[PDB]
Symmetry: C3
Amino acid sequence: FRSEADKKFKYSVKLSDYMTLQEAATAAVDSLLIDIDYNFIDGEAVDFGGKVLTIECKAKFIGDGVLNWNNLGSGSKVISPHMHTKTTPYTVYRFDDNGNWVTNPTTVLASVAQRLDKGYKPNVNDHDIWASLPDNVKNQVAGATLRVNSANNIIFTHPEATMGGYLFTLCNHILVESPRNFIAWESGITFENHHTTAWGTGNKVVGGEIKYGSGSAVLFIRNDGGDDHDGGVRDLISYRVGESGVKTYQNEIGGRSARNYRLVFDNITTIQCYYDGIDVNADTGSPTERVDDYTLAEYPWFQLPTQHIIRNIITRDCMGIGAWWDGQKNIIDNVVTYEAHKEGMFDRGTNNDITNITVVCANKDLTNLNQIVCEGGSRLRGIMVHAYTTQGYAVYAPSSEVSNVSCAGSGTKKILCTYVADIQGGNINVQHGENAMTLSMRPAMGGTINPSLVLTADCQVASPGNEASIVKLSAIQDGARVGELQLNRLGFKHMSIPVAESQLPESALEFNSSIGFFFGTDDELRILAKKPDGTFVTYSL
Amino acid sequence: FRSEADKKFKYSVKLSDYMTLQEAATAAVDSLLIDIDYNFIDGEAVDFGGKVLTIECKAKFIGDGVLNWNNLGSGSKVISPHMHTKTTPYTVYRFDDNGNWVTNPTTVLASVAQRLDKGYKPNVNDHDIWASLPDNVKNQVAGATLRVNSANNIIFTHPEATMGGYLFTLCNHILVESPRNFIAWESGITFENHHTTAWGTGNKVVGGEIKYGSGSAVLFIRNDGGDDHDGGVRDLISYRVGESGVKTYQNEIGGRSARNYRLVFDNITTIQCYYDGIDVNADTGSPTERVDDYTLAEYPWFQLPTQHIIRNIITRDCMGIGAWWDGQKNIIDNVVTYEAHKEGMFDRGTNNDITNITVVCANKDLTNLNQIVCEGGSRLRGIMVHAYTTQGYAVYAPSSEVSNVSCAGSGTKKILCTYVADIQGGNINVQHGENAMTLSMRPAMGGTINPSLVLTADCQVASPGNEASIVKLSAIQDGARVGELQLNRLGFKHMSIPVAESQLPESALEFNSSIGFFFGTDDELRILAKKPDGTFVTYSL
Amino acid sequence: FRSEADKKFKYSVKLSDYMTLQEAATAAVDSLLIDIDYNFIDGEAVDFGGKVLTIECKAKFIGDGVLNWNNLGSGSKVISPHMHTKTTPYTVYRFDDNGNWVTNPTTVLASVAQRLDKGYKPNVNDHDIWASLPDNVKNQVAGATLRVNSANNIIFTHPEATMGGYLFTLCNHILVESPRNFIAWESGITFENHHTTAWGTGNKVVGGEIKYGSGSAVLFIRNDGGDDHDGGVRDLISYRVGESGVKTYQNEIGGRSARNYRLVFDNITTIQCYYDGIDVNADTGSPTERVDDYTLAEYPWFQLPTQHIIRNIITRDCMGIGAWWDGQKNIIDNVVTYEAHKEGMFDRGTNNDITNITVVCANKDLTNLNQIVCEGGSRLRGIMVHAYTTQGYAVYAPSSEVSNVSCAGSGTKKILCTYVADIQGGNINVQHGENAMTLSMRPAMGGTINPSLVLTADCQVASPGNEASIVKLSAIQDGARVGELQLNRLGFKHMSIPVAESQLPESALEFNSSIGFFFGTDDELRILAKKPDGTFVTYSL
């Protein structure tokens, strides 16, 4: 039986009419309004009975520990939830009053204080202070996590947190739009799918900003986007997280591979994370057989066919690597990193396609690291490096090929690789502030230090419309420049011609109809002439 | 009369209170809840009476054929609808167990099977199998389409489909946000405006992913964004559609131009479509007078002033062209295509502005197609090609100008165009794995095969700090290299000087105060000297 | 007391049950439905009593002047509001029937007419017509503004306007998603925070399109995103606004600094604004001490440490500067401007990092302006210019450093800066349509006009496989090319050797074992020889 009112009005129940969230969920039919703050107990569970609910949040879930949401019906939506810690945690704050890193371990230790607004909870990855922490801190109980278990096709809009976060366990097609006012506890949003051999899919974050937390802003465990590439992160700012800007988990959890495949990471801005601007790796540490994943014999360590798409990434002043990945058959396009403290860009895999990379001021801590590294056989096109140090290489990619590479400024400009592509274009018009400038050519690049050819333009009078110069061109022999022709030395408009120091052999003139000058045993100047018919005569002057 | 309850509670009606969707729509005032699956009949119509409704979908519309929605009021919103086929269609599945194309027509034919999850319905564009299909398949009745007729200013959020789609007929300012869980039937979302001489406008898709369907993920017919550029597609993944990743229709439908103008396509990822990664063309096939559009006399075929903006596109392993367009005054920036089976990027129009294009491994099927083609007079800046074949050209753009072009690897590096821009920069520092490397200059590029100048650095001893080289510089004559100077041949530190084979004429020394060596009629070595005053003397040695 | 109906139905009140919006707001508990158009009076106020409301708009707010919304509770959402003018304003329409600028002041004056659809209200920034306007126009009363006062954490979805806009005063964490059907009055969305010394934060626009208005599409006053970078604009189209595409206010309002810090501007498309494609400046005009901001002594004019992130910007045919900013420590990446009437890209600050800039056809009005300008010491990497005029410089950046710069076409290609980075790569393969082409090197670039070295490839016969050329290489002296070697002049396969016009001094041969030819006082050809031991002898021929 449905009365006339039942047929004309929207069904909604509100939390303030009940003692518990379970009582409200039981009563709910269509909508569930969270109209008053709710103090949950660690381990509390809410059974939604498979109902397709609109959960409209106008207040906070407050607790230390986990609130479990079970049997939420496919197609439900959760609108502006907010997970807030009950206890104020001690946090480590690694920044000074100018917003720069503080690394002195004594000063870092002294930053540990109860805060709701910034910093993250100290933990094992905090190698500088972990061993020095007093018991109340290591043993603190705080942080509010929502754990949504075994739900499919749920949309969260504008979720928030204050020392809290969201854990989706064995879920698929979870869409989280625009996290905001979001101070994380551990990882901000986690898609945890390792409890079965299936792969989580369709789980994505789009929009917004996640701040702090001891973990990564978004974390994937045993997710596979399919050839569909349905899953990943788009349009996110990850700010000062304790681990990596976003992360794909590596190796095993609880005995099953927690790795990830075929995701899309598009437009992620990572500011001052403590580890890597993005960490899209699947293997880490020493090789160990994979469980419920490809074997070592199928794909060697660091070489899984992850096939991620990574594009439009920018990271700034990250304490780890500016952006990195392993595996193979990934596509990476448009990655910009500034002030990475370790390498600026790192490919730990092989057989990846890498384009439009810009690295500025990596190796910021001067520990002899390279700006860009590739460990395997990758293909790089459109690379710009601006090192603010001479340490190491601009591009260290011994087994890779490179094209369209530019190294700016006065830092390292060294490129080590298998193949460097041609330069193409029209007229060449180069200029320099220094009085002399050069074209240098270094073939046999694997086994030479010095160029085989140097052509020099040397400006002797720099007066506009009244310029004077010397032109030079030289080969090399025993590591020293030799055989140098010059034009216009001292303004005399002549060619200076290098001549042999002793008897020239016939083999030293390659082509018919050519000559070479040389000095004889008593310094007599002579000409060896190779005639048009290939025979030889010598003229004495 | 309104009672007190009427003044305090939200109006909503729910489908489960009625037999039909029309009965529910008639009763509706504010909200309409779809709380149970609805089995519609092909051709069913729902008249919404001009009401401004919130249509909250928590279940599916199920049918074979069309469900018409008429008189939906401006400002309505449709929340998470789902169009689901009643009959399971036979679909063609063009991929193997590794996710690679299957093209053997026998194997493709054998992939035809009833599926709800993947593949698309076989149709006329399936030239390889169309003629071989048994009657039950060609004549199958399946697929669920919502047709929204003559509505303005409607927002759809998170629409879904299972062998279904959405058709907007004579609509304007339709916004479709984040299609998802979306397996299309024909084209996924279509804006169909050719029934009148007006142009549809403001119709856009933003976000999400559309999969399969026999058509294009989003299709525009007689839409014009205005100088406003209000209309198009942003932030979409188009996965394995049967036609093109997104498409602007060409030519006429039912006797009226179905073409499109002034749209924005921003951040589209197209994976393995059967035709073109994007198809932003307006004319196709043989020229025929346009109806209710610009005449042939006003704009020639392929040269309509479409003025689209196309940017941030990436396509992978598309069976057609990686990305293409016609018309003029379009702006194209940041297009990356991998593994296009036809051309990687194609401009079929003229007078377009094209920047930041990256094409890798186009012409994947080795049918002698070029990596990048422009048919008209376009302007290209910032082009990277990496062909994995020597077939054809990297850039085939005879009437275009190019700047900042790079061709990687060992594939084709040929550039054919009207003008190639200058290279600018500072010191030049080039390197190569091979023992010799070159600077080559090929002026008269329209009519030469061989370079007019080659400067060679040839490393003879590649020992670090103990290098030896020969430097060479040569002109060309009758297609063969000639006049070669060398420095340091065989380590003798001398210049090898080319001399004339016979009498040098006075005209063969251009400048006053210069000399040339030559051999006389009996092989006598001589010097022709052009004195400082321009007169001549000959020295015999 | 709550009855059984109270416990099962959603609370909503609707405007049509009341005379005023205040009466409806007073009655509201959860939701407030705007079900009929509401005619507000200028200065009207609505007190929402701190309630957390869902304001569901299905009709318009209509008025001339301001509607104030006060005490709206944190966490409220405002769904599809529409601000519509009561009086139809006179607007100026600066475009012809082809959508091109009209600049003849007589024609502009004649475009002033009552419109609801396009143009903006004439004002003081309209220097061409302001003094010529008849009283009814300058004194017109029109335009509908919603002013939301002192609210935190409010989301607006899909707001609209017809000669209207949205003003947020002393607000924080306002998120405006997807403005649309939005014809602005002044600035479209403004975050106005100068009334106190606090800085507004978290205020952002994401998505959509704003059209016309006399101001800027989005305007920031005294906002600071924090090191968090929480605030700014993402994914917006700004179309034909009367000021700048988006803007950070400069200097003071009412005696307090109205400047802005640490915002993100990502993916803004600006079409035909009357001032600058984006205006991200903090100081303007003549230096004056800052109030409640950094002093002049702390940071000089134009050099505040704004630390904005600006990326993925595209602007077209803007009447002002294509895109510009001041301050320092900003990051700018991926900015494309077409048809800017003033400079294409302008850095008025110093110590900024600038990458991936493409400027085409700036200085469109031929007023002798440069394509790209930097006033301070910035770092530029990856620059493409295509000037359609020879006026001025491609890059005018005297105190900056540049790397990877390309200048296309036949317009200006001049680069003025402190340091130009090296070109790196492999073999060099250049080509040209002209019969001759060159490598030119211009060291001492600050003080020279002409190159110190020119190497020329000159094609004399352009027949495929039958090519003939002359190779040339020359220095410079007294501003004229000199000392020219040639190879293969007139097809004789010889070297033409430049010789001194008079006695060569010993100093004119640098290296041991070298010779130079010269003419003696009676034109005798001679050889000065520098022997292997460094001593000299002269041979007479």
